[PDB]
Amino acid sequence: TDETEEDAIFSLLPLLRKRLIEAHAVSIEEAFMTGDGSGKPKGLLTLASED
């Protein structure tokens, strides 16, 4: 929000962008490791179980 950037002593944007990018990386990594099949790529553990 607009009234939080002024309402602080330091900036808060770089933290936001970093958290977004790393959240993407974490989610994709976890989904590839053990993601299900419904709407998400099948995880290696799930593939090995179903085979």
């Binding site: 977004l20 993407h24 994709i28 976890e30 989904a31 993601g35 709407g39």
Partner: protein, 51 residues
């Protein structure tokens, strides 16, 4: 006292079904987080002697 800041943990994104691509669920979910802090302090040690 001395005080610094501790950067928070990690979030994650979400997988959207390709069916809901037209709607407003396309963007997905939201990531949130807040900082913390730590403190330091000292203690006193002394000894005396007479001659």
């Amino acid at each position: 006292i001395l005080t610094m800041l501790v950067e928070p943990d990690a979030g994650r994104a979400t997988w959207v079904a390709a069916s809901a691509y037209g709607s407003d669920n396309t963007t997905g979910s939201e990531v949130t987080g807040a900082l913390t802090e730590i403190h330091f302090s000292t203690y006193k040690l002394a000894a005396k002697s007479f001659i």
